[PDB]
Structures are given as structure tokens and as C-alpha cells.
Amino acid sequence: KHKILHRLLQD
Amino acid sequence: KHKILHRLLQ
Amino acid sequence: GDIKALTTLCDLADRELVVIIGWAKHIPGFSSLSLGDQMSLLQSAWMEILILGIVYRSLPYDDKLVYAEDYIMDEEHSRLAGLLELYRAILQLVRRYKKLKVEKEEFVTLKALALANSDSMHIEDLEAVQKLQDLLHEALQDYELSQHHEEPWRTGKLLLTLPLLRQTAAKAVQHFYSVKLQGKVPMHKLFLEMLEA
Amino acid sequence: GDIKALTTLCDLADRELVVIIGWAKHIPGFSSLSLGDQMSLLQSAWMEILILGIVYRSLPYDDKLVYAEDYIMDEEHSRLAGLLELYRAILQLVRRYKKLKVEKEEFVTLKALALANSDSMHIEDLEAVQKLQDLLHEALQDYELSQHHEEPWRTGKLLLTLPLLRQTAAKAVQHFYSVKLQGKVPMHKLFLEMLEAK
Ligand SMILES: CC(C)(c1ccc(O)cc1)c1ccc(O)cc1
Numbered sequence: 092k093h094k095i096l097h098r099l100l101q102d
Numbered sequence: 103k104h105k106i107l108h109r110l111l112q
Numbered sequence: 113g114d115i116k117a118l119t120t121l122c123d124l125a126d127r128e129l130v131v132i133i134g135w136a137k138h139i140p141g142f143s144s145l146s147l148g149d150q151m152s153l154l155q156s157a158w159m160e161i162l163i164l165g166i167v168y169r170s171l172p173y174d175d176k177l178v179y180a181e182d183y184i185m186d187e188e189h190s191r192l193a194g195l196l197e198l199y200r201a202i203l204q205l206v207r208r209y210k211k212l213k214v215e216k217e218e219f220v221t222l223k224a225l226a227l228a229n230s231d232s233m234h235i236e237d238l239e240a241v242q243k244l245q246d247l248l249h250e251a252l253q254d255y256e257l258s259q260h261h262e263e264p265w266r267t268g269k270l271l272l273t274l275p276l277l278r279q280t281a282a283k284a285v286q287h288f289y290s291v292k293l294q295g296k297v298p299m300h301k302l303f304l305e306m307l308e309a
Numbered sequence: 310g311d312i313k314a315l316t317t318l319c320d321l322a323d324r325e326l327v328v329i330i331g332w333a334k335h336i337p338g339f340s341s342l343s344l345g346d347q348m349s350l351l352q353s354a355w356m357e358i359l360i361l362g363i364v365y366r367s368l369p370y371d372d373k374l375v376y377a378e379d380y381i382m383d384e385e386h387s388r389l390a391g392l393l394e395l396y397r398a399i400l401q402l403v404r405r406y407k408k409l410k411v412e413k414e415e416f417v418t419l420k421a422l423a424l425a426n427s428d429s430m431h432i433e434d435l436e437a438v439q440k441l442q443d444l445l446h447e448a449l450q451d452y453e454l455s456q457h458h459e460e461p462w463r464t465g466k467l468l469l470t471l472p473l474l475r476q477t478a479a480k481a482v483q484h485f486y487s488v489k490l491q492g493k494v495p496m497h498k499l500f501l502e503m504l505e506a507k
């Protein structure tokens with residue numbers, strides 16, 4: 092899974 | 103173990 | 113006992129992960145990759161990068177691992193908490209890096225190169241990832257030729273430690289995944305996300 | 310069948326080990342190590358070196374692995390014998406080596422370097438082993454400077470495939486150790502000794 096990683100890379 | 107390897111390396 | 117030490121260690125890693133990710137977004141060219149490819153590289157390499165930080169901090173010490181500048185583990189404390197094998201494997205790296213006197217600047221470039229050299233399974237754009245790897249490799253070679261010209265093959269000596277780094281990172285992941293399944297050590301969601309990937 | 314295919318594959322490996330051992334005995338300086346250290350390096354590196362031989366043999370092919378000149382496996386036959394994951398991992402090495410157009414002379418130098426760089430845990434004379442690793446690394450750099458001067462970081466590109474090589478070799482050892490435990494595939498004594506070593 093990657094919910095947190097994906098948000099941290101987006102912001 | 104290494105009995106065979108030892109022998110082949112002399 | 114083992115529970116509080118591992119909890120302390122895993123809390124330290126969750127804090128480092130936030131910094132790892134922020135740092136990686138600033139690697140030249142990394143953010144030009146797709147988000148999927150960025151996530152695949154990081155999910156493959158996060159532990160190699162964490163272990164490089166441990167090795168770097170551990171260079172001033174002998175037979176001790178500095179997981180944080182305030183959390184240092186010797187052989188007996190590692191044995192008390194089930195980490196003796198991992199402690200010994202990471203020491204093997206510390207030996208190689210101490211002998212080569214690897215510098216702070218070299219650690220940061222090896223972390224970035226290890227990230228782009230991850231060999232992940234689900235890369236969408238192989239060519240983009242390869243081009244990033246080539247640039248980061250070239251950065252290291254350029255640095256070594258400029259800063260250590262009289263050690264002709266210094267880059268190669270650094271590169272030759274990367275198999276052991278990848279091998280040790282994999283066994284670290286397996287060890288703490290086993291801690292995860294046992295359920296006695298609480299873990300934060302980001303660490304869990306990287307660990308279960 | 311998976312029985313016969315895996316039996317054939319393991320027999321091929323045992324026959325290549327004979328060659329591997331005699332080849333290692335002539336690596337410059339290798340025979341100056343203690344017998345114990347010689348055996349530690351081999352028991353650590355044997356699968357890495359075997360896989361580099363597969364990679365070199367597979368370069369003329371597309372999506373096939375040449376385990377011997379007369380034994381080639383494609384995706385479907387690998388799946389039939391439980392080797393699909395290992396086949397895809399070795400093919401990822403083939404991909405990089407094909408792209409770099411790695412030469413026969415470079416494979417030999419990389420096999421020797423991989424042996425000396427194996428990171429065994431029972432080394433008696435660490436500095437003798439480090440000296441040998443340094444010479445074999447220098448041999449590869451010397452070759453690359455002389456033969457590929459216009460590709461200045463070629464050595465490094467070769468070295469950067471070694472983490473995947475070690476990772477894939479480790480996976481192969483586990484898989485055939487699993488086959489060993491199941492007990493349906495006969496295996497020769499030298500292969501067994503390397504597979505069970507630690
Ligand atoms: C992943 C782990 C919890 C860690 C903790 C802190 C850290 O800075 C880096 C890594 C770890 C890995 C390997 C190890 O031997 C101990 C701790």
C-alpha cells in the first residue's frame with residue numbers, strides 16, 4: 092500500500 | 103560441510 | 113526489555129522515513145519520474161538508505177551502532193533484544209566504510225544512487241529510471257575525480273559495498289516484518305506502510 | 310515434467326561446478342589464500358558465478374535462458390517447472406548485460422571479482438582477501454580504460470549490476486534448497502554440499 096507515501100510525495 | 107570441495111581444491 | 117528497545121528503534125525509523133522522503137523529492141530529476149515509479153524506487157530502497165545513515169553515524173565508534181546520535185547499541189545490548197545478527201551484518205559495512213574513510217558527501221550520493229539502482233519490479237518507465245541512475249552515478253564519478261584524483265578507483269570501491277548493503281537491508285526488512293507479525297511492538301503507520309510493501 | 314527438468318538442471322549445475330572450481334584455482338592469488346578462506350569465498354559466491362554464466366550464454370536469445378548450450382528454457386517451460394520467478398529475475402540481468410553489450414572477457418573478470426567480493430562471514434585472513442579483491446577490481450578497471458576509453462564510467466555500470474546478481478543468486482539458493490527438502494529431485498554430492506553450506 093502507499094497512501095501516506097503518495098500524499099507525502101504529492102504535497 | 104566442505105569434504106568434496108576440499109578434495110577438489112587439493 | 114526487547115519490547116521497549118524495538119519500540120524505540122521503530123519510532124526512530126518512522127521519524128527518519130519522513131526526512132528520507134522529503135530528501136528524495138529534492139534529488140535532481142527524481143520528481144520528473146511518475147509518482148508510481150517514485151514510490152516503487154522508495155519502497156525498494158528505503159531500508160538501504162536508512163542503513164547508510166546508521167553506517168555514517170557509526171564511523172566514529174568501534175563495535176557500536178549509532179541508530180540515532182542519542183541511541184547507540186553495543187554487542188550485548190543487541191543480543192538482549194534479538195538484533196545480534198543484524199548488528200553484526202551492519203558492522204561488516206561499518207568496517208568497509210571506516211577503512212575507505214567515506215565522507216558525508218559520499219554517503220548522500222550513495223543513498224541517491226542506491227535509490228535509483230533499486231531494481232524494483234513494477235517500474236513503468238525503465239528508460240527514465242535508467243537515465244536518473246546514470247546521472248547519479250556520473251555525479252559520484254565526477255565528485256571522486258575532482259576530490260580524490262590520487263585514488264583512481266575510489267568510486268568502484270564504494271560501489272563494491274552495494275551488494276552487502278542490499279543483502280543486509282533485505283534481512284533487516286525480514287527481521288522487522290517478523291516483529292510486526294508477532295504484534296507486541298507498536299508501530300506507526302508510515303513505517304508499517306514501507307515495511308509491508 | 311518438473312522432475313526430469315529439475316534433475317537435468319541440477320546435473321548441469323554439478324558439472325559446471327567442476328569447471329568453476331578448477332577455474333577459480335587459477336585466478337591470480339586465489340591459491341595463495343588458506344584453503345579455509347578459498348572454500349568460504351566459493352561457498353559464498355558459487356551461485357553468483359553460475360548465474361553470470363547463464364547470463365552470458367543467454368545473450369544471443371530473446372526471453373530465453375540458456376542453462377547449457379543444449380538446454381534452453383522459455384517463459385512457458387519455466388512456469389511448468391516452478392522456475393517462473395527465477396527466470397524473470399535472471400532475464401532482468403540479461404536485459405542490462407545485453408544493453409551494455411558485456412563481453413566474454415568482462416564476464417570472466419566479473420566472476421572473479423564477485424568471488425573475492427563475496428562478503429563471507431568466516432574469513433581467516435581479511436586483509437589477504439581484501440588485497441585479492443583490490444587486484445581483481447584493478448584488473449577490470451585496467452581493461453576498461455584500455456579497451457573502452459570512450460565510455461569512461463563503464464566499470465561502474467558493470468559494478469552496479471552486482472546487487473541484483475547477489476540478490477538473485479540468494480533467491481536461487483533458497484529455491485533449490487526447497488527442492489532439495491521436498492526430496493523428489495535427485496542431486497549430486499558436490500551440488501548438495503554447496504547448496505547446504507554454512
Ligand atoms: C529499521 C530500523 C528500525 C532503523 C531504526 C532507526 C534508523 O535510523 C534506521 C533503521 C533498524 C534496522 C536494522 C537494525 O539492526 C536496527 C534497527
Ligand SMILES: CC(C)(c1ccc(O)cc1)c1ccc(O)cc1
Nearest residue numbers: 318319321322325359376395481
Ligand atoms: C543452479 C541451477 C540449477 C543451475 C543449473 C545450470 C547452470 O549452468 C547454472 C545453474 C539453476 C539456477 C537458477 C535457475 O533459474 C535454474 C537453475
